[PDB]
């Protein structure tokens, strides 16, 4: 990934949300970085930007509660959002303008994959990972009983097995906790190794579970 985003995941109301967007590789481009957010099921909303001259622009709604900055020694761009409420729950993206424009949305040629932020009073909980064992064939992993929803990560064979993988959207169970399933279809020759790597960052839960017949 070129623009690595980091954030706390689950935040309580009135706290200050602090997000980072780190440029992971060297680029001879004098680029600008823009922060955008997307509430669940909604459209893209501009937060602000910082140009190649470090000129920092803020959208009208953000100018009184957002601070955007850059640490060049780390190639790390920071966004701070004060006094968050549930209305600030969204996926937060950073994106690069290769022209160096800090207040432009028409040419964002490189995006971070987003960092989820859920603002709520409810306690963080790490998931349990269970194997969906085969009886082509199908296998998978059940990531159950966690909060908040994302950032959650599910890979197979540490990223080697990607074809035929269906990671389903998380559902909110009646217990108030989220559950998710990730399945993969493989030939009935299964001997070979099938491990699912799940990472719930808000709870520091890193589980590599082997699925066997």
């Amino acid at each position: 990934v070129q623009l690595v985003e980091s954030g706390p995941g689950c935040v309580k109301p009135s706290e200050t949300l602090s997000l980072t967007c780190t440029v992971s590789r060297f680029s001879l481009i004098g680029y600008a970085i823009t922060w955008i957010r997307q509430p669940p099921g909604k459209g893209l909303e501009w937060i602000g930007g910082i140009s190649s001259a470090a000129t920092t622009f803020y959208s009208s709604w953000a100018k009184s509660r957002v601070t955007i900055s850059v640490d060049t020694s780390k190639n790390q761009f920071s966004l701070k959002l004060s006094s968050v409420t549930a209305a600030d729950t969204a996926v937060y993206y950073c994106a690069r303008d290769p022209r160096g424009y800090g207040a432009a949305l028409d040419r964002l040629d490189l995006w971070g994959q987003g960092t989820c932020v859920t603002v709520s009073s409810f306690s963080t909980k790490g998931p349990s990972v269970f194997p969906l064992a085969p009886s082509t064939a199908a296998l998978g992993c059940l990531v159950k009983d966690y909060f908040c929803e994302c950032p959650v990560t599910v890979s197979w064979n540490s990223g080697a097995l990607t074809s035929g993988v269906h990671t389903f959207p998380a559902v909110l169970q009646s217990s108030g906790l989220y559950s998710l399933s990730s399945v993969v279809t493989v030939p009935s020759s299964s001997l070979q190794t099938y491990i699912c790597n799940v990472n719930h960052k808000p709870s520091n839960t890193k589980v590599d579970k082997k699925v066997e017949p």
């Binding site: 959208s59 269970f130 059940l142």
Partner: protein, 213 residues
Amino acid sequence: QMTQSPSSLSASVGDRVTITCQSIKSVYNNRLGWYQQKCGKAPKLLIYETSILTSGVPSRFSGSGSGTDFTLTISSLQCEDFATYYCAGGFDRSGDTTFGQGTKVEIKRTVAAPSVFIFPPSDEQLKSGTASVVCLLNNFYPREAKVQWKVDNALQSGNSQESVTCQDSKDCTYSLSSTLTLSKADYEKHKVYACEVTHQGLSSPVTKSFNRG
């Protein structure tokens, strides 16, 4: 803030579709871009400066228009084009820039029956007092599908939840997971667990089952 039209559309593979973007103010120096956002992924810059395709974007995509009215055309709609498309405009140099509301694009294809798999609760989960039985409907079209749970041929209700993937980039199909949740005692009280699938692609409902043990 900019107006996109329509809010959503559907067409078949190989059809030509158009999305319109309109603004109140004229676009400054052709700063109008088109982004494609697939499910769970960051938006991707398809077109910048009204009509220039970014590298790697198939020539099936094209952009046109000027001033306040712009068009994104997909000349040969493909399954990998399932996404929400956003226009983004800049109107001055000081901070007047925004996104459109977005247009969802769905692709119609032939009826495809799902492949049904069933997964009993793992022994790890049975170590606790809960049991999750998973039913997987793989690669079906259209989305409409009925999933019914039977425990000793008794219909369940209120103890199952389902999740659906987005249209697949290769074959335009959906996949669905239905999780039935029971207590350990209730699970150990019964023998045959079945999930029955009703879909247009099946001449009759297809039931997959297992016997506990």
